[PDB]
C-alpha cells in the first residue's frame, strides 16, 4: 500500500575532495534532492560555528588552518528537524604540522612507555623516531597521522629525551619529549 512521504537525500558537495595551495581560493557548492524547497547552511566541523547560509561557501586567502571539516546542512523550512548533512574535507598543501612542539613526561626508572606523536599536512605525513624500535602508524584524518612507539626508560633516554620527526614531500617538522623522574 503505497506511501508518498517528505524527505531530503543526496547531499553532494562540489568539489568533493578539494586540494588548494596556500593563498588560493576555494568555492564549495552543496546539492540535495528533496520533496520541497530547501535551505542550506555551512558549518566548521571542528567548531559549532556557522559560516554562511545558502548553497555556496566562498573561501579566500587560505591559510593552513582553514583545512579540514566543512559540513553542509540541507534543511526544509516547512518541516522542523527534516535535514541531512554532508561533510567535505579540504586539503591545503603544506609541510608537516606538529600537534605539539615540546612536551614533558614524568616517569619511573623500571618502566616502558607508549609514547605518541601527532602531525598534520598535505600530503599526509609520516613520522620516524630517534630511537630503535618498530612504531605503529594510525591514520585517522586524510591529513593526520598518529605514531606510537614503545621505549624503555634508560638513563641515556632521560639524558637525551626522545624526538619524533614528521616528514612529507613539502618539508619536515620535529617534536621532542622530555623524560623526568620520581621526585
Amino acid at each position, epitope marked *: 500500500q503505497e506511501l508518498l512521504v517528505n524527505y531530503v537525500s543526496d547531499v553532494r558537495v562540489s568539489p*568533493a*575532495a578539494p*586540494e588548494r*595551495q596556500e593563498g588560493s581560493s576555494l568555492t564549495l557548492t552543496c546539492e540535495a534532492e528533496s520533496s520541497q524547497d530547501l535551505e542550506f547552511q555551512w558549518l566548521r566541523e571542528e567548531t559549532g560555528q556557522v559560516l554562511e547560509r545558502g548553497p555556496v561557501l566562498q573561501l579566500h586567502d587560505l591559510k593552513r588552518e582553514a583545512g579540514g571539516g566543512y559540513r553542509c546542512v540541507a534543511s526544509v523550512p516547512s518541516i522542523p528537524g527534516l535535514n541531512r548533512t554532508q*561533510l567535505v*574535507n579540504v*586539503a591545503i*598543501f603544506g609541510p608537516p604540522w606538529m600537534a605539539f612542539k615540546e612536551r614533558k613526561v614524568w616517569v619511573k626508572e623500571n618502566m616502558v612507555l607508549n609514547l605518541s606523536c601527532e602531525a598534520s599536512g*598535505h*600530503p*599526509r605525513p609520516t613520522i620516524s623516531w630517534n630511537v630503535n624500535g618498530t612504531a605503529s602508524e594510525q*591514520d*585517522q*584524518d*586524510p591529513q*593526520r597521522v598518529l605514531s606510537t612507539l614503545n621505549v624503555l626508560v634508560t638513563p641515556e633516554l632521560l639524558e637525551t629525551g626522545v624526538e619524533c620527526t614528521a616528514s612529507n*614531500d*613539502l*618539508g619536515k617538522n620535529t617534536s621532542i619529549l622530555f623524560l623526568e623522574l620520581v621526585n
Partner: antibody
Amino acid sequence: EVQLLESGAELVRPGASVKLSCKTSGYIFTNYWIHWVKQRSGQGLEWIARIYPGTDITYYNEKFKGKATLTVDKSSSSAYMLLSSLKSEDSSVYFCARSGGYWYFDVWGAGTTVTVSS
Amino acid sequence: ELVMTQSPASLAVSLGQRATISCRASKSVSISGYSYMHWYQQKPGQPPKLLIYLASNLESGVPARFSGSGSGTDFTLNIHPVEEEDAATYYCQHSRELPYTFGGGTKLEIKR
C-alpha cells in the same frame, strides 16, 4: 588546458639505456607530482615511480629500482625517466601522468613506445 | 604488495542495459572515511582516462552514466545505460600504500 607531451618512440639495443621525456604545460609544474606507468602489449598497468618537482623527492616501485631513474628540469617544466640496461621485457609503452596529494592521475601523456631489439 | 583483483575480465552487455565491474583489494584501501580507489577507462591507441577518483566521485566531464561505490576491500564501477563509445578496458587503482597497483583490467564488449 593541462598538457603532458612525451618524446617520440625509441629503438634501443639490448643493454643500452634510454631517457624518455615528458614536457608539461598549463599548470604550475612545481605543484603536482609526475608518475610513470608501464603498459606492455596494450594490456595491464604497472606503476613505476613518482617525483615531486618542487623538492626533487622520488619514490620508486621496488620492481623498477635499478631500471628507472626519475629526473626533473624545472627550467623547461619537463620530467624525465631513464631506463637502464634494457632487455626484451622492457619493450612497452611508458606513460607519464600528473597527480595531486591523493595519488590519482587526472592527466596522462600520449605514451612513448620503446622497442628493445638488435 | 597490494593486489587488485578485477572481475570479470571480459563483459558483453547490450546497449541500454547496465555494466557492473568489480574490484577487490587484498587489503583495505579505506582509512578515516576516504577510500583510495580510482577507476580508469582505456580505449585503443589512447592513454588511460580518469573516470572516478576516491571510489565514488565523478571526474568533471565524465557523463553521469558512470558511477563508483564501495569501501574497504570491495568496489564497483557501474555504467548505465551503456552507449557505443563505452567499448573500452576499465581499470581500478589504489593509492593507499606504495607501490601503487592496478587491477588486471576489464574489457567491455557491446552487443548489437
